[model samples]
Target chain A: GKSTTLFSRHTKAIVWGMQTRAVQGMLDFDYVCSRDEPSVAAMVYPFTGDHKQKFYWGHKEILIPVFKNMADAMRKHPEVDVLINFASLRSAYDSTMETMNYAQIRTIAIIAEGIPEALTRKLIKKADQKGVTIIGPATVGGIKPGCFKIGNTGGMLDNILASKLYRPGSVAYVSRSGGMSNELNNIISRTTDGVYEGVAIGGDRYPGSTFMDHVLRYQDTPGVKMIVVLGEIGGTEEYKICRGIKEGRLTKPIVCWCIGTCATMQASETAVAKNQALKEAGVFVPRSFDELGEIIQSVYEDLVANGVIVPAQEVPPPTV
Target chain B: SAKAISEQTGKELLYKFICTTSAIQNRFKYARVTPDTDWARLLQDHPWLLSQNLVVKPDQLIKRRGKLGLVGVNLTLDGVKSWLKPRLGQEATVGKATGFLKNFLIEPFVPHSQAEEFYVCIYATREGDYVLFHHEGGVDVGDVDAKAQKLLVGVDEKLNPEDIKKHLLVHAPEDKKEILASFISGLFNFYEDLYFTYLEINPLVVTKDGVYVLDLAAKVDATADYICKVKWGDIEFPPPFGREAYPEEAYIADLDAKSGASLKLTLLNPKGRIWTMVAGGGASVVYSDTICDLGGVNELANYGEYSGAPSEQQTYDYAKTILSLMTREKHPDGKILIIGGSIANFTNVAATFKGIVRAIRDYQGPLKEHEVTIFVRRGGPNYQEGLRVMGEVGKTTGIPIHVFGTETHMTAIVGMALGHRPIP
Candidate 1:
């Protein structure tokens, strides 16, 4: 299938920065979500020496292996494919390119935002050649409810509970803002069954992935009956999803609202033009950001009412 | 993050890189003057600085200077000063922003017909570097994106002068084909070495002597600042046009620059009542949006973020500046200190909250006198401990602080502080 996945519920990965709290948060999600194994196999924190990082698994304490280098981490855990890179803007390019050569890493989520465009372009071209997927140079990564997740994605543990991200839902989403991605998670839990997966491709002008990349991913996802895309002004990335629907490449119901619609009269006009193009292409675009929640609720309700999506059984609230 | 380099420094860095090849050296002549420097002395020092007609314009990242009637072309040394005098140290408004004209670039105006001018922009993306070329280039080159031819050089690929000729030189004048090709190739190489995310040389004048970069704009990956220091000596990343630079912003920038953690501040309104101490970049925007949505738009004073797990001192310094600004003037209605963020994936909430606790302790007197009320909502690693510290600070300090865990929605605090809703 053209829709390939870079992450799975059992996919273990490594982190590249000294993200102690982030690593712990991932484990917390793993415990709450009831994954059989923790998602983080080992962490590649450069500043620290090879050691173990302590984390909590529900009420019990656990330790995940940590490495000072990617090669050592990869050698120890060949099963790890995704790399949640927390490297700063300065070193992200070199670290990302180096990981691409390792042949084990198929997906990388870069959390830094200020990577030079030139460097990012080089990284993108190389990653495409290697058939690897990149989540962000400046992103909050993504979350697969009850499955694997990238670093710092879906926000804190309480948010995970609030958004009911501890379990899978029927709706899948992709967005530009990491912060807004969490907001989408909250809105989805309230409006629909909940998110099956959510990806924030980052807010940079040229993100590693686009709205089309993940929405297309959602199309083939059996669990994902609907798509929610939150695009923004500045770039024309949102148009690709619009084109996908027009070309009959996407049949799933999509709910989209491009933010920054109120940024400029010129921008608002551009957004209206794109929104019109999208709506004309047979996609459901909300009238405004304020109207988005209601629109999502209606679309989700219609999908459920038609028996197109048989909502999954809700799980018990996770124990802290 | 890509930081846009000013045209002055961009030209300087590009020229330095281009000069390494000597063949590209002596192709362009330019002089940059600071505001306090004597322009006439600079002309006399060089003797031939403005011997010919000169082009003088502010090099402070001001866009569309020509259309704004700010560029002084066909001017002698005296003419340049006469044009620059009134504008220098004077407040000028461009669209909605107003700022001082401090530094300007002076280059010998290379007289050329419309055909002699060409446009070339090489932009780096995640996939490859895209070079856009247009033969019909000048100030009036409307929508070069629509008109320009494009070439994408893959990550592992190299740019050949032959490729430049085949792609970018098709419509160029026959005599200048080779010249334009070599210049584009050399320019792209310079862009690569300097880590420029975007580089544009509009109206790249092809004179008989060589090429003149009439106007150049570029941005470099600011993360590479540490590595590129020797290459780009003492480069200053200035604030965007119209927005004036403040010492507080610079202080935070310096803190961000030194630490591995990200700390940034932009004082939108010094006395704006609604102050934000946000965590993530995305979290910051949502909080701001909710505040604006709740009709506290005008009261939104600051937009700043401290993420990537900054040290306690770094967080304290960040909170200190915000508290300093918040307490600068008392508000008629008590000010809102929305220390809000979404569940952090990794940032140590307890660690950061400790920093906030210290700052709150230091500023208790002013915070009370200023009638500031604190509303905190955050969830992340060790957040229970973070909230514990913050909650205790509120109790001990006798401040009207409302703190909530991840159970509270991210923007719900915004509504609570603005009085749109009661505590959840």
Candidate 2:
């Protein structure tokens, strides 16, 4: 069960904060993907009493129920397994701690940044023990193309279609930067087929999920044929991927690039060293940031030429 | 962000919480001397200045002050006064940075042999917190990462003194092992309670009389300031050595402190030809990396971000501040303004774009005079409307603007601006 994907066309999520725009964005994405129902089950806005919020579902107005607390939301919508937490930095810890209490919730994505490292570590340990997958405390969330989009991931429906995210592809990526993840979506769509799943694990010092955690999941998934890793200068999270590759745990071909080669404060390993290590581990390491797209294209062409991947049929998404 | 605090404040915190409760006697006493400190009042309040031999060092966040000859030891009150007269308001270079010494801390000097001095550090990591100790300390701690023994305490687990002694204090002296272990155990508790990200006490001198923390370096999780303000007391985070705080930088910092959304601005080169009004923390770094990789590092002006779906007015203010700085000077090659970001998760593109549009209109005259060219790339909720309005504004204001949707790569604009790629 741990090896499988976290989202599907049938998956539903409850937003933790009052993010009306994000809920609508998810609905728009779902509509374009031609899902049977909207991915957002309800919203949890503790600041207000229980009510319903208005949104647009394919140009028709619909109302999604909102509750004032997590208990009531979970009780009302037992089918909802994911929570998109939009609580601020000061309250993200306590709100996320409360979110893990309900056994029905299997995944959580914290959108807030600057959460104290101590509190983040505590959240990580507890979530691990509870068998819950947390996406971020400072993340932009994740997206499974043509299946489900978390919060505001994959951006507007037009861009999603342009990135070929309305249908699943063979490439999946894990990154620290939410913004760069979108860039990866653009690059993957142009170079290969399109993104299978993309996750921005948050840019904090201690992310709830790591590169290895999601890469291993990608390895287990039957659809993910390749993996793209976007890391940075400070942390050693990239090294774990290297170890995973060396030990034969990760079998999918990986295209790894670590930014911040232009900057280093002597606090951690430089990007140069990380790139070198990733290269030595037999992963596809780009010569520079400029060459990232070229390298991805090369890996993808290699996979295609060897019959490892058959490009899927492209279908236009419905215009919302 | 982890903020470094003054050494005097760290000791005050340690003495208040760690020393008073444990068997260790509270021997921490110090006087803070600032630029505006009244000498007569300072002497009146702290009469111990004349009664004891003291150690004086700049309170600014400068590392290896002792090795750099910035520390004056075994100094009398008159000796400290004479030393302060020259160093105060005088600039000194450490490493590559240079800044004036405005704050100093004077503590009673602890007399001990080299062997008595030890090193202890407590730091937080993703898995847990690590406690590191070394037998020999002082100026020559000598790469503690290799020599020091480390013990990791799990996130939820409590520290045991026995675990500390067995793991970290094995190389420590036989007689002082128990005392050092207990002090370290108590110190770890203090570090966790106060939300400290890093704490290091070098030359933790142990003697028959007492334990003395000769020098300290500390950084607190500033995001926890709201919750830990009362416990942390009145602590000020000074800028790092060699870099003085610009008024604009301070203004942005104050704005960041008050707003729920993140707004940061750092002026790397005010006169540089390339300026960025990027969104998202990680995206901002990528833009800089691409610019630097394309050989635009010298022309890159600023490094900052505006994310978390800031209010329209907040975005306007942020945009206005950047425009004000960018228009203050001119470059011969004609400056370029890059307004870029990844497809935002939830941030409303139209609303935030409206703010930047307003700021751009306000600076229309200056922007034209500076011969500026604007390149925009972003996608999110209502991005089509956001991009449409931006395109219209460039025509209305008669400024050359190149706008792209999420179809273009995030850093492609950086390449286009720097002439590394053809503008499509």
Candidate 3:
């Protein structure tokens, strides 16, 4: 019943995106489900009719009711296409299959924790090759008001972020994780004078567009004069941005902040040392959460100070 | 020249320059090029005028030898001597200054132009007013034409229509408003010079001399914020001490111009343990979460990033700079650098990674950081390349890397590294 609730919400988002298809509304995305306990089930899942992340997710019968609701909703909304329910760890797969084998869902137990990232990354790379955007590896989904929600944070939180970014024409916000996407959308919308699009790229190992992809979309976007990028430690994704800059594909005014500012002491495997590496790259990083919001706000201020008014752009406007 | 261009074009214009009025004399590269000539030639032939000559250095961009408000503009043959006469008084070998000014004072305007669409850029600050400006024919604006034109405009901060006694219409007729707006919007396209980034006439000059650049300057915002959006490629950093000099190293040096944490790794003898991780400023936690989940927390060797803490917007650029610095000798056991992250707080991974991939190609021969077994695991606001770029990096770097999504354990390395335990 909990998942069914999400399915209903997801269906709503799908409908909204389809309604706005003139804007090239996309339904292609990803999602990640985090663990929650059952005692807090009532609070987590307000939809008694749909299944959701209640405290006791390991229970089969509890999970089935939610699946039943989802099946029903899917059957009703033929317009809602492409769905992926991911649980990659072995236990996750086992637990998931134990409750979900009744449904024909393609599942894989990515053995990254028990093996080397090399092996897991291969599968991730393959998925990336498949053109999957917003890898919600440890993420939720992107929920537009009309269609199905991809990743699931509480519906209330997603709604809050969406409302913040639902301007006529602004930026197209894209993030790998659900919460961070909301954080970014909220911060940027408030700071950039209402410029942006909502996005929640579920945290899979791979996503459709890299920060590179979004920057391009933003760069080409007539509504967005700038982009706000948020990154964390331990990955080479930022380095990829540098490469884009070097090559000259990126040209929009951008502001970014990486988490783990004090991660210099972390072990290499723990990826603590990578912080310094990230810090040194011509990447101008904000120091903390306060600074993150400030940096984004500052960009808007700077653009304003510089007398740069973003043009009134229509979605899917003519490209220069 | 403004008068001539204004009269010729018959349209108002604005000349917007970032520098003070006096600096324009030494900095107007767009206005000095000979018709159909290259900027380098005229630039090389001219000597610089020194307002102040306290410590004249050959390499300095500006020679402010005097105090504020005392800087000289449009220095001529004797103008330099007059200023130097006071400082050196009687024995001043002001020939160099005089010659520099003489050479630069009246360089002919070049006549080359790129027909770009005009764009009227307007910016309004929270505390100030809207800045509106426009230009006509640009990219190769001639000095005489520039002197005779009026091609820029800005709505005065004091102009609130409600405050006006009556709605007044001047400049152009109301019926031509759309055309004027369109023309105004296309100001950047009016330029005829490649060296000119902006030719603004604040209190925009709207005249005929073919829309002159009353105040002319090249694109001055060339930092990561600027370059990130500019159409440029293949910037190299110099090699490090005693390390095999790779061209990518030269790219690393360019990192100073960027503003993001971009890294390059050389995983030769990974010892099966080497990793060059370029962490995004906002992505530190996400990365650690991925590394620990992937079970690689215990297998790291070195970690660093470029774009050392600058300020706000500069952090998401120069991924190329960091990567360029990395490609050196490989590790003995074949290194594996993981450019991983948990999620973005506010960074564009796709855009930033484009820089890294581009640099990897340029620095390919000497700097090969994305080599050997590379495993990438990342998830966040943007993770398209969390797998794609990693996959490419592995292919380019001679490594068989793995790319994982958020659903995969961030600490996936635990499954691969020796003595590591699986997620029970």
State which docking tier applies to candidate 3: incorrect
TM-score of chain B of each: 0.94, 0.94, 0.30
Residue pairs in collision within model 1: A22-B346, A114-B1, A115-B1, A120-B126, A121-B125, A121-B126, A124-B126, A125-B127, A156-B343
Instruction: Write the number of the candidate with greater TM-score, choosing between 1 and 3.
Output: 1
Each prediction's Cα lDDT score? 0.80, 0.86, 0.37
Chain A of candidate 2 gets a TM-score of: 0.96
List CA RMSD, all candidates.
4.2, 2.9, 21.3
Which whole-number lDDT from 0 to 100 does residue B197 have in model 1?
Answer: 77
Per-residue CA lDDT of model 2 for A23-80, tens digit only, reads 8888988898899898998988788998999998898888899999889989989998
Distance (Å) between predicted and true CA of A252, model 2? 2.4
* Ranked candidates (lDDT, high to low): 2, 1, 3
The regions of model 3 sitting more than 4 angstroms off are A1-141, A144-147, A150-320, B1-72, B77-129, B132-324, B327-338, B342-376, B379-424
Model 3 Cα lDDT, one tens digit per residue, A38-154:
111111111344543221223222321233344454454444333433333333323322323223222211211121122223334444334333233334444332223333332
Model 3 error, position B52 (Å): 22
lDDT of 3 at B147: 38
Give candidate 2's TM-score.
0.92
State which candidate has the highest DockQ. 2
Tens digits of lDDT, candidate 3, B1-424: 0111211011212223121211112123222211243445543654332222211111111122222222333454245335433432112223132212111123223222343212133322212223232333232323423232132222112333322112211333344344434334344233311112233332222232233232222221122222222322332221211224345433544554342333333322223354545443224344443344444555554344432222322333344444333454455454544555434433445555555555555655544343444456554434565458756865775545567665443434424432355322
Model 1 agreement with the true structure over B148-167: per-residue lDDT tens digits: 98998877689877777887
